[PDB]
């Protein structure tokens, strides 16, 4: 019978946003196929889940043997004449396609996220089929005053960094809608900036576990607020299963920041 499956070997299946997801889909060809005008298989990704429909790839079909159209649910439709499948009447054909994570919606962090395909011959539509669950987690912070830490500070911008063996290794850049790469790259990095509540966030991050060995996720102080030392070093944090989604924002990791004296203009 049909099956989609994430081709993912891992007992926990965490990515960070813009990270390629590799699934296949195995659909049915019926013995009459070649008696039928057209074998349909659409795509229909769960909210968060984009599929890339120029990744698409049907073992043993070559590409001017179909059609693929990108539809508005961020899924794609494959439209395969009946005739092209005339040697496959009886097996199972298998598709490849890589998928990623796009959070445009914040309730979206640390659920499970599955894709769904349903292929249809003529009319009749098979049963539609589901992908094991992803899932991408995020982190919360507080900007706060080191010795009154009730105090919350506006006007901190942080980046975020990967540390290893006591210095910053890469950069990211890019957000949880665009999709993040990390480089050595100190340019253009992903960046927040601090209102009066001192709350700011990186969302749409795979789990800690789920770095190389030896590497921490970090935050890198590149503005203090208004009166305030700038952070000699990175903090350090930890995104686990369900570290976003269970903090309100005022409730994130408390950073400490010290005061400083001014200038004379
Ligand atoms: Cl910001
Ligand atoms: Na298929
Ligand atoms: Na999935």
Redesign the pocket.
Known sequence: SDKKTLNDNRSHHDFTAGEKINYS???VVPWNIANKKVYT?TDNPSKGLIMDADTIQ?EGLASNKYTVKKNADNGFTITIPAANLAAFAGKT???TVKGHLSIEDLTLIDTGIPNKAT?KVDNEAHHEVKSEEVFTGGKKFVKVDGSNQSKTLAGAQFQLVIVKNGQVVKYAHGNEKDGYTFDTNNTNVATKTTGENGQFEFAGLKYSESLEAGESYAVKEVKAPTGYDLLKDPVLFTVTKDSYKTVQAADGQKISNTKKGGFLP
């Open positions: 889909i195995e659909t298989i049907i054909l298998k598709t292929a």
